[PDB]
Symmetry: D2
Subunit: 253 residues, 4 copies
Amino acid sequence: STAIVTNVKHYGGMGSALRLSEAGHTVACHDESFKQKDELEAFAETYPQLKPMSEQEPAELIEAVTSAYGQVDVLVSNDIFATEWQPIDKYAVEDYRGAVEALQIRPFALVNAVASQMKKRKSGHIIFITSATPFGPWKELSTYTSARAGACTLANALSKELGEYNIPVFAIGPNYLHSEDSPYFYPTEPWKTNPEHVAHVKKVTALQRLGTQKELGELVAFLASGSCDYLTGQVFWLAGGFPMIERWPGMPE
Amino acid sequence: STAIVTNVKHYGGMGSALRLSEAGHTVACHDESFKQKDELEAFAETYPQLKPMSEQEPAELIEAVTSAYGQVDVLVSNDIFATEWQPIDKYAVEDYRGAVEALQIRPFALVNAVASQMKKRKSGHIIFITSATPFGPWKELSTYTSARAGACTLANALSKELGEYNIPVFAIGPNYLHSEDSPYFYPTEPWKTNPEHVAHVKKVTALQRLGTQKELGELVAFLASGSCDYLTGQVFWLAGGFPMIERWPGMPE
Amino acid sequence: STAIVTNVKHYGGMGSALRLSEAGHTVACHDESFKQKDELEAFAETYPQLKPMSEQEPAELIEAVTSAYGQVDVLVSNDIFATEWQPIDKYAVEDYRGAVEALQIRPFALVNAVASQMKKRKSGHIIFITSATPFGPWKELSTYTSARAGACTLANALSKELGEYNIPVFAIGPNYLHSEDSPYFYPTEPWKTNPEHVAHVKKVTALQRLGTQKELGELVAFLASGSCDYLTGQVFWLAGGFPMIERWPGMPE
Amino acid sequence: STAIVTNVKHYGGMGSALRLSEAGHTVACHDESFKQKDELEAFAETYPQLKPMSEQEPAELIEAVTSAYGQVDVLVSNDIFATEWQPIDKYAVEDYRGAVEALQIRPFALVNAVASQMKKRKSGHIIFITSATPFGPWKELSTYTSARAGACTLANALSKELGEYNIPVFAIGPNYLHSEDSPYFYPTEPWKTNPEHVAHVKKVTALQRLGTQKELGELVAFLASGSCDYLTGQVFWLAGGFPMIERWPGMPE
């Protein structure tokens, strides 16, 4: 079984790839840095169980992995975009354009490229990593939030046609996921260190902590494993019970 | 009070313009066909209560109406897109891109242009016309369905930031809205004539009929009146009880 | 046209009753205080446009209004229940039974009693005043919240069978609805007087204010008017943009 | 670790208890028929890894299992209720009362009895087996459908308070979950043996098949493993892509 995990250095990329590997998949990895030969080799050295690819664009990635490992069985579109808190009228229109390109068009493109080989053999697993922000939106994050919602509905809508070919489709929408060295979106600094940040996280989640790469990775492996295909179409909120809702005056923390 | 309704010939364009004009708003009306003087001036003869405009692109549209009528008080983004049932692997990536430009980036651009003046007055009403398809996705309509979902969350996210400036933001998402002579998306032929189309609507909606422009016009006017601003954030499902879910074997219609 | 509003003194009862009357409905009013001829006659004096009934049980409440005005056209089940913040293990099970009785059984019993005459003349309007609590749960309000959610879905489920009879069904879920002198659930005091409470409502809603009885009443009258039946099965969040979600450290409110 | 599965011969009970035992939980099993010596003993010789109990009532069961095996670590409220297709005016009000008792009060009562011990040690796992009918309600199932939706929100709200104490709370809403010999709610005969039923499941699910008990049991065992507590508060729609929303005339199945 061959897996593809994108932007592997960021977001839920590492927890996906490491736990898919441990579960017996062959895991090919995309990342923007893998354009530079040193960074692809530094990573392939540090994680010899992972197979970093240099391919950057969606279609060529699917063919590069289909060529080298025979097929693509599991697609994890781990999508990222660097956003900015802005009031609506401060955005430029191209700001929304890049957001939909990185969080909506990119996963659509990969499914577009991998679908026929999955449909023809009637086997496959597709997982979008989206965002839990559609579920409780902060103000002044209009582009990133609305785009992630288009990705959630894309996964849901795709499950409706892909089920007849036995291809389950999933959307994992995290929030407050510890991203370690990656800045998307909760690096150890400052979310694990700065006490104003650790106290924010204890307030806004139910579990009063960040989620872990292992947790995200366990979910990806479980859905990728074929053990529960009947969840096809599900949007998962991986946000530790976010959002916590502000209660009336006089109520304890 | 001055209103803007887009693509006024199609979807819920007529009901919005026709009913906002009765509630006393000045209704500027946009449409692709108003590019040609002949089409625009025919429309203003047929509809003396309405004010057609030649301007077609977002910033120009806000400018012209603000120039002619002093300000833009109500924004009805009546958004449309040429559809096409298709499996995921048969779209071109350009098919999604265009679907997102028309159904996400365009309402965004309009809000992006008009928000500062509304925010200046600390008043305004913004209504996206979207789609009930995200609430019950059909298979093989994944570009139009997911794009429309991004437009709903954009409305809801926007409401969080603009409420501070006393601007409600709403999304009306319709399905099975009788579009008279417009092919977007339920023209009289065949949807009121063909006995297979007629029995489809009876089966899949709870009220067993198409939706009227008057009903959408009434909803748009109600929201733009300032009588129920406290509904801000709402995605309305204007779909007669769609979807009707298929019951067990041997059960009546 | 003849309408019933329950618990008229509390929650969305006064706004419903008053605005329904201004639109020309005969408004018969149920309330627990109307058991004393005292309270009934004082209400009838203060509100001569409203018709307070003594009947308390749902079946005989429906029949008495039917016997006095011929038929019931609009049902507004304005349900309430006295609430207690509790950890789950500190409730008695009876606390939840009482909550379900007031918030699911009661509106069920009323529609159980009124639906035949509505179905028969193939006209009628049913509106539940539920709650916006299911949309963003506070911790330690599990009984009241899960109960209101049951009523939200009962409204949506009722719309599926009743549209065949041209009966639309609605749920309206308020949060931070100013209830004047009613303690259910946002009386003028403390919520418009104590500046800590004033700051809480400015923090948690997008419009930074309470809802008004009139806003709720305009929504009910609009729904009850037959102007927009295609919205059947809708759950309206009348919570002024609640919930606002607490943002990252260092970010303005 | 000790787990309790209720109504274990029915619905998602056999998959919950079989799969949880394979993961090395002690699975105490509650079921109605275990009031009979011969029923409980037969079950125990056929399933030597499961521990059937005779206790029926919620407080009695938790205490028995805490008595025999020290504590309750995992609770699976597999709640079941017989009902009929019927219009709203045909139910007695007692029919909804019973639905609420069997599908809402009982899960509540189990958590109310066990929450205190789980909170004391700040560890535990609570899973409700509810229903996916609230996601796509059929007409004329208002009592069951709405009760289930109240259990879903019970789970979600309970997660917001038990997160502090590190107790994740989940709901799992099946539909078209094949139930083998149990009549709740998709027994093998007729759903896999009759062609009229075989085609219905092919039409209304995206995967065109029923859900196996192993799939539910795998889900239950995953959430009870402590490998993904960050999912706490999730309602999972274990229904295989249900519902498949009927498409325009002339379009193929």
